[PDB]
Structures are given as structure tokens and as C-alpha cells.
Amino acid sequence: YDELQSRVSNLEERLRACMQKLACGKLTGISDPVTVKTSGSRFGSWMTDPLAPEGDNRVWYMDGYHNNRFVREYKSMVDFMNTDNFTSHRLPHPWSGTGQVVYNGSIYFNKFQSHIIIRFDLKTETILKTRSLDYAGYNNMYHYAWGGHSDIDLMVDENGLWAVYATNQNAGNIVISKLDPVSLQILQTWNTSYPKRSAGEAFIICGTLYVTNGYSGGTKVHYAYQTNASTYEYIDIPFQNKYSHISMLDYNPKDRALYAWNNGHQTLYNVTLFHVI
Amino acid sequence: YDELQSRVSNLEERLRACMQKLACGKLTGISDPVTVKTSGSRFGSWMTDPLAPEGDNRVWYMDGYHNNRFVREYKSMVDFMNTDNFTSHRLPHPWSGTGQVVYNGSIYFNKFQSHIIIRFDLKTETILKTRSLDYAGYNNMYHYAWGGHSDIDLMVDENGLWAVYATNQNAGNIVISKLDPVSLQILQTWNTSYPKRSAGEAFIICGTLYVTNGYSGGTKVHYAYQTNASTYEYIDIPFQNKYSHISMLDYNPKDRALYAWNNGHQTLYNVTLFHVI
Numbered sequence: 001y002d003e004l005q006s007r008v009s010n011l012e013e014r015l016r017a018c019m020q021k022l023a024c025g026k027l028t029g030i031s032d033p034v035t036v037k038t039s040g041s042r043f044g045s046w047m048t049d050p051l052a053p054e055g056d057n058r059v060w061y062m063d064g065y066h067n068n069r070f071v072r073e074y075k076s077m078v079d080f081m082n083t084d085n086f087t088s089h090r091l092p093h094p095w096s097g098t099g100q101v102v103y104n105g106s107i108y109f110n111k112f113q114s115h116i117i118i119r120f121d122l123k124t125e126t127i128l129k130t131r132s133l134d135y136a137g138y139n140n141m142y143h144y145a146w147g148g149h150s151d152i153d154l155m156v157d158e159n160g161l162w163a164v165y166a167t168n169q170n171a172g173n174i175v176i177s178k179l180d181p182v183s184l185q186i187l188q189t190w191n192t193s194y195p196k197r198s199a200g201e202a203f204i205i206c207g208t209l210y211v212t213n214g215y216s217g218g219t220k221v222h223y224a225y226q227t228n229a230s231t232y233e234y235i236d237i238p239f240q241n242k243y244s245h246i247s248m249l250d251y252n253p254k255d256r257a258l259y260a261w262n263n264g265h266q267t268l269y270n271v272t273l274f275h276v277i
Numbered sequence: 278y279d280e281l282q283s284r285v286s287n288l289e290e291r292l293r294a295c296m297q298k299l300a301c302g303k304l305t306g307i308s309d310p311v312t313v314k315t316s317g318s319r320f321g322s323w324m325t326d327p328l329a330p331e332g333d334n335r336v337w338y339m340d341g342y343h344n345n346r347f348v349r350e351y352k353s354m355v356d357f358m359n360t361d362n363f364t365s366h367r368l369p370h371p372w373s374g375t376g377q378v379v380y381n382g383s384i385y386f387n388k389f390q391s392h393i394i395i396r397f398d399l400k401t402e403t404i405l406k407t408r409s410l411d412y413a414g415y416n417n418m419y420h421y422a423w424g425g426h427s428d429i430d431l432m433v434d435e436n437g438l439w440a441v442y443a444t445n446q447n448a449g450n451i452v453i454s455k456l457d458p459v460s461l462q463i464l465q466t467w468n469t470s471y472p473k474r475s476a477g478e479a480f481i482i483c484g485t486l487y488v489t490n491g492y493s494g495g496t497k498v499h500y501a502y503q504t505n506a507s508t509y510e511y512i513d514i515p516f517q518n519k520y521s522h523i524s525m526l527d528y529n530p531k532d533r534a535l536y537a538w539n540n541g542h543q544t545l546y547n548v549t550l551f552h553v554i
């Protein structure tokens with residue numbers, strides 16, 4: 001009775017570990033952009049839920065960076081590529097910038113003019129947790145190169161929920177934090193040496209943070225930080241700013257793709273991860 | 278009863294498949310040579326046992342390519358690097374060239390001036406199988422660039438036992454074949470587009486054949502053939518030929534290393550493999 005349970009538990013653990021080890025590597029190439037829709041103002045965000053059961057593919061959409069509390073939900077990708085019909089939901093507080101994420105059926109965003117991370121339910125429409133990001137800048141203090149109140153950037157990867165911000169103690173450099181997806185508590189922090197005001201955008205792939213150089217023109221992935229080894233490396237992986245302005249750029253584990261907001265348009269990039277043995 | 282046994286069998290199959298998919302990949306670089314021993318004539322063949330019981334790291338040594346029938350049984354690497362004591366075992370027939378292999382508990386070799394593959398026991402000292410390679414050249418008609426009656430090359434990888442030869446029907450190009458480790462029967466054959474007489478050496482990592490361009494001077498991995506997709510590609514992977522003339526270069530999956538014979542010296546290379554996800 002107990003021996004077979006131990007055997008199946010070991011089997012599940014080994015399957016999970018081996019499939020996670022084969023899941024990702026290091027990025028080496030970014031594909032050409034693919035445009036889905038043209039809507040909204042030049043600044044905004046759009047994403048999908050990674051931990052969603054297959055067959056939902058609900059696209060969440062947000063327009064504006066200063067004063068907005070309306071989020072759009074499209075019931076399918078085909079309902080977002082062509083159909084202009086959506087469901088509008090109202091947030092208790094307006095967000096700042098495009099550094100919001102959707103994960104585990106809830107939206108993580110930043111409160112207006114404050115360093116407060118808020119978890120909001122998109123199904124029950126209620127509030128659970130409103131925590132404070134310890135030692136983080138707000139109100140265009142440590143924004144990206146394009147600005148627009150992007151001081152806090154929330155993302156997810158195969159390991160969980162991460163927040164990229166900057167600390168006055170760490171000059172103005174990029175600081176990575178791993179957050180509990182329930183209590184929004186600090187688990188582990190990595191303090192890098194790349195300034196956030198000269199970044200423009202950043203994303204995380206399964207534990208490695210890739211930081212862009214600029215936002216318009218010759219955009220390229222300039223910086224890489226490995227939190228497991230706590231090391232850094234200057235790369236030169238290039239991509240293409242087709243519409244000459246990038247405001248949001250996030251990595252979505254399930255689709256293994258980079259969702260991007262290109263000058264008021266919704267675009268996708270494809271990553272090329274390699275593993276060395 | 279049956280359900281848990283089926284679950285255990287599925288767990289074993291998935292573990293084996295996932296560890297084999299995480300094992301090897303496309304070769305990307307070769308490290309500097311490491312010399313272990315200096316003995317014998319300029320041409321010879323030394324190799325280890327991939328599928329061996331733990332605690333049996335016995336190396337196998339052979340000198341000459343024409344009429345020698347004595348093999349050496351240095352029981353340990355420390356007993357081979359420094360100790361000059363060995364056990365000499367006789368063969369029923371002398372070998373041709375430096376292309377032989379030691380797999381599991383037997384040795385596969387070629388029988389004098391014939392296209393005959395012989396399986397010989399290194400413990401019971403008898404013959405179980407002696408077959409003929411179909412349409413394979415012999416007696417210095419489809420040798421390597423260095424000659425020396427290396428018309429048939431035998432190697433092992435994570436998939437099993439492979440033979441590289443050449444066929445009159447396929448001009449003088451390299452032909453790969455998968456052999457049964459027990460019955461020495463042809464399982465599947467692959468046609469490549471690289472002539473064998475201009476090759477010099479070849480080795481298989483896992484289902485991919487890498488072919489060198491020369492034997493003394495500027496040596497590099499020049500050709501690659503994927504038998505799973507049956508596609509060829511010309512690559513440029515230099516490796517350093519420290520001691521001029523090379524005679525044998527084979528791959529060991531257990532150590533994941535290239536064993537080589539460089540002008541009477543025994544050398545080791547540690548390979549680097551990468552996988553794209």
C-alpha cells in the first residue's frame with residue numbers, strides 16, 4: 001500500500017523535474033513580430049492566463065497608463081483577432097503603467113501613485129490581498145526608458161510570480177523579487193547592476209531575466225541575469241521594433257511567446273531557447 | 278496489482294525516454310586533447326566498455342592493423358596510465374585496421390582481408406556470431422584518408438551498435454548501418470554523400486554521424502548526417518591535432534568522450550553537445 005504510493009510519488013516527481021529541465025534553456029533568437037489586432041491608444045497592455053485550462057484562451061486587455069480602471073476580456077483568441085466584442089470589468093483602483101499580469105485566475109497590478117501590489121479576482125470580482133512592495137519606487141521614480149509610470153513590472157514564468165523594480169539602496173538598478181501568488185510576500189530578492197531608467201523593457205524566462213536596451217529604433221536584448229547562479233552577461237540578441245515604439249513586453253510560459261504592445265497594436269514574438277549538455 | 282505494475286512500467290518507460298532525450302544533442306565544440314599513455318606503434322586502437330557492470334573500468338588496447346591478434350586487458354585507468362602490467366588475450370583471427378569495438382561483454386572486429394564481422398567473448402573466449410557485412414568493401418578499397426585497411430568502422434552510441442562502411446553501388450560514399458548486437462543482422466541502412474576515402478575518421482554521437490576531413494595537420498569535423506531525418510550538413514568544428522598523425526577516433530557515451538589514437542599516443546577529448554528547444 002505504502003510502497004506503491006511512494007513509487008508513484010517518485011514517478012510524478014521525476015516526471016515533473018525532467019519535463020521542467022527540458023522545458024527551457026537560454027534565449028538565442030527572436031522571431032519576426034506577428035500582429036493580431038489594432039485597437040486602443042499607443043500605450044497599453046494585453047496578455048493571457050498561463051494557468052488556464054485549455055479551451056479558454058481568454059485575452060485580457062488594458063488601455064492607458066495614467067487613469068483607467070476598465071479591463072476588457074475577450075472569450076477567445078478568434079474573438080480578439082477579428083471580433084470587436086468584449087466584456088468590460090471595473091477595478092477597485094486604477095493602475096499605473098503596463099506592469100500588470102494575469103496568473104492563477106487573478107490579476108496582479110499596481111495601485112495608483114503607490115508601491116502597492118493588488119490581487120484582484122476576475123471571476124468573483126472581489127479583493128483578497130493588497131501588499132506593499134518593500135523599498136520600491138513609484139510615480140515615475142524608476143520607470144523604463146519610455147517612462148509612463150512603469151516603475152513596477154509584474155511577470156510570471158515556469159517557476160512562478162516575479163516582480164522587477166528598483167531600489168534606492170541599489171542605486172537605480174534592476175531588482176528582482178519572487179512573490180507568493182497568494183500572500184504577495186517576499187520570498188527571495190536578487191539585486192543586479194543594470195539601471196532601470198535606461199532599460200526600456202524586461203522579461204523573465206524560467207529564471208533568467210532579459211533586459212532590453214531601448215524602446216524605439218535599434219531595440220535589442222542587451223542584458224541577462226541568471227538568478228540561480230546570480231551572474232550577469234551582456235548579450236546582443238536583436239529583435240525588431242516594427243511599429244517604432246514598445247510599451248509592454250512580457251514572456252508567457254504556456255505559449256512560450258513574447259506578448260508585446262507595439263505603438264497601439266498587439267504583437268507576438270517567438271523565442272528560441274537552447275540547452276547545452 | 279496489475280494497475281500498479283502498469284504504472285511502474287509506464288514510469289520506467291517515461292524515465293528512460295526523458296533521460297535519453299536529455300542525454301545528448303548536436304555537437305558544438307571539442308576540448309583540448311588529454312594524453313593518458315605513450316606506448317605502441319603509430320597506429321592502434323584503445324577503447325573502454327560502455328555497457329559494463331560498475332567497478333569494471335577495464336580498458337582495451339590493440340596495436341597494429343595487419344596481422345596482430347593480441348589484445349590487452351589493463352584492468353583500471355590507473356592500471357593503464359602508469360602501470361605497464363596487462364593480460365594478453367589471443368584472437369582466433371587477426372583484425373584489419375583500427376576499427377573495432379568493445380560492446381557489453383564482447384568485442385566486434387573485422388576478419389583479416391574479408392568483409393566479415395566477428396563477435397568474440399572477452400570472458401569465455403569463444404565465437405558466437407561471424408557474419409558478412411552486405412556489399413561492404415575490404416582490403417584497402419574504401420579505407421579512410423590515412424589508409425591502413427580501415428574499410429569498416431564499428432561504433433556504439435545510446436541507440437546501439439553501428440557500422441560505417443562504403444558500397445560500390447553508392448559510389449565510394451559513406452554508408453551507415455544499424456547492427457543487431459546479438460545476431461549481427463542488418464536492421465536499417467542510411468546513405469550519405471561523403472566519400473570514405475577522403476574522410477579520415479568518423480564517429481556517431483547519437484544517431485548523427487560526424488565525419489572529419491583530414492588526418493594530419495588541420496583537422497576539423499567537416500560533415501554531419503542525421504539518420505533520423507536523413508539530412509546532411511557541412512559544418513566547421515575544428516579540433517586540435519597535437520601529435521600530427523591520427524589513426525582512430527571513436528565515441529564513448531558512458532564517459533561522453535572521444536577516444537583517439539594520435540601517433541602512438543592515447544588521447545581523450547571531452548565533447549560539448551547542445552539541444553535547441
Ligand SMILES: *[C@@H]1O[C@H](CO)[C@@H](O[C@@H]2O[C@H](CO)[C@@H](O)[C@H](O)[C@H]2NC(C)=O)[C@H](O)[C@H]1NC(C)=O
Binds near residue numbers: 104
Ligand atoms: C491556481 O489556483 C488554484 C485554485 O485557487 C490553486 O489550487 C489550490 O492548491 C492548494 C495546494 O495545491 C490548495 O491548498 C488550495 O485549496 C487550492 N485552491 C482551491 C480553491 O481549492 C493552485 O495551487 C494555483 N496554482 C498554483 C501554481 O499555485
Ligand SMILES: *[C@@H]1O[C@H](CO)[C@@H](O[C@@H]2O[C@H](CO)[C@@H](O)[C@H](O)[C@H]2NC(C)=O)[C@H](O)[C@H]1NC(C)=O
Binds near residue numbers: 189190191
Ligand atoms: C540589494 O542591493 C544592495 C545594493 O548593493 C545591497 O546592499 C549592500 O549590501 C552589502 C552586503 O549586504 C553591504 O556591504 C553594502 O553596504 C550594501 N550597500 C548599501 C548601499 O546599502 C543589498 O545587499 C542587496 N540585497 C540583497 C538581498 O542582496
Ligand SMILES: *[C@@H]1O[C@H](CO)[C@@H](O[C@@H]2O[C@H](CO)[C@@H](O)[C@H](O)[C@H]2NC(C)=O)[C@H](O)[C@H]1NC(C)=O
Binds near residue numbers: 381382
Ligand atoms: C548486455 O549483456 C547482458 C548480459 O551479458 C544482457 O542481459 C540479458 O538480458 C536479457 C533480457 O533483458 C536476458 O534474457 C538475458 O538472460 C540477460 N543475459 C544474461 C547473461 O543473463 C543485456 O541485455 C545486454 N544489453 C543489451 C542492451 O542487450
Ligand SMILES: *[C@@H]1O[C@H](CO)[C@@H](O[C@@H]2O[C@H](CO)[C@@H](O)[C@H](O)[C@H]2NC(C)=O)[C@H](O)[C@H]1NC(C)=O
Binds near residue numbers: 447448466467468
Ligand atoms: C543507396 O544508394 C544506392 C545507389 O544510389 C541505391 O541503389 C539504388 O537503389 C535504387 C532504388 O531506390 C535502384 O533503383 C537502383 O538500381 C540502385 N542502384 C544500384 C547501382 O543498384 C540504394 O538503394 C541506396 N540505399 C538506400 C537505403 O536508399
Ligand SMILES: *[C@@H]1O[C@H](CO)[C@@H](O)[C@H](O)[C@H]1NC(C)=O
Binds near residue numbers: 547
Ligand atoms: C573529461 O572527461 C574525463 C573522462 O573520465 C574526465 O577526466 C572528466 O570527466 C573530464 N575532465 C575534465 C573536464 O577536466
Ligand SMILES: [Ca+2]
Binds near residue numbers: 250
Ligand atoms: Ca515586461
Ligand SMILES: [Ca+2]
Binds near residue numbers: 430432479480525527
Ligand atoms: Ca571511428
